[PDB]
Design a protein around this ligand. Structure first.
Ligand code: CL
Ligand code: CL
Length: 162
């Protein structure tokens, strides 16, 4: 298992514009297009991202391409963030993937906001961090996915994904 596979399971793949769990326009493997309510604004963002007049539908290769970019962006944002970087640096490979997943879903800012949990992860207090991470809107809104990510942090294995 690896980050790409992990995220492909968490996000699925849609080749036609769709609305995510929060109601925002998305496409592909979890690629958020816009938070505006306008399908047109979404279509425009899509075209601009893809580089062609898409009519709201893309190919598998187009999706995979956005996906590669988005994962690269996530890691680079972690590495550029003063709060996230030290955490990431401290973790083993599997857990690093768990952190990228959270950033991928919620954004660097969002994750940087889990101050207390981050500190716990940094300290390697797995069980405590898992409980702290559970007390969040994130967990409450997307419990199954959150559970998978949280188990990954707790255990340091891919069990939740197999
Ligand atoms: Cl983009
Ligand atoms: Cl979920």
């Amino acid at each position: 298992m690896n980050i790409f596979e992990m995220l492909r399971i968490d996000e699925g793949l849609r080749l036609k514009i769709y609305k995510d769990t929060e109601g925002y326009y998305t496409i592909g493997i979890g690629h958020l297009l816009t938070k505006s309510p306008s399908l047109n604004a979404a279509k425009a963002e899509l075209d601009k991202a893809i580089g062609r007049n898409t009519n709201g539908v893309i190919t598998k290769d187009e999706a995979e391409k956005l996906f590669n970019q988005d994962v690269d962006a996530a890691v680079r944002g972690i590495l550029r963030n003063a709060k996230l970087k030290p955490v990431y640096d401290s973790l083993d490979a599997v857990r690093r993937a768990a952190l990228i997943n959270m950033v991928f879903q919620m954004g660097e800012t969002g994750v940087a906001g889990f101050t207390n949990s981050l500190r716990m992860l940094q300290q390697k207090r797995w069980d405590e961090a898992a409980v702290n991470l559970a007390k969040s809107r994130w967990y409450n809104q997307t419990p199954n996915r959150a559970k998978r990510v949280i188990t990954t942090f707790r255990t340091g294995t891919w069990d939740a994904y197999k």
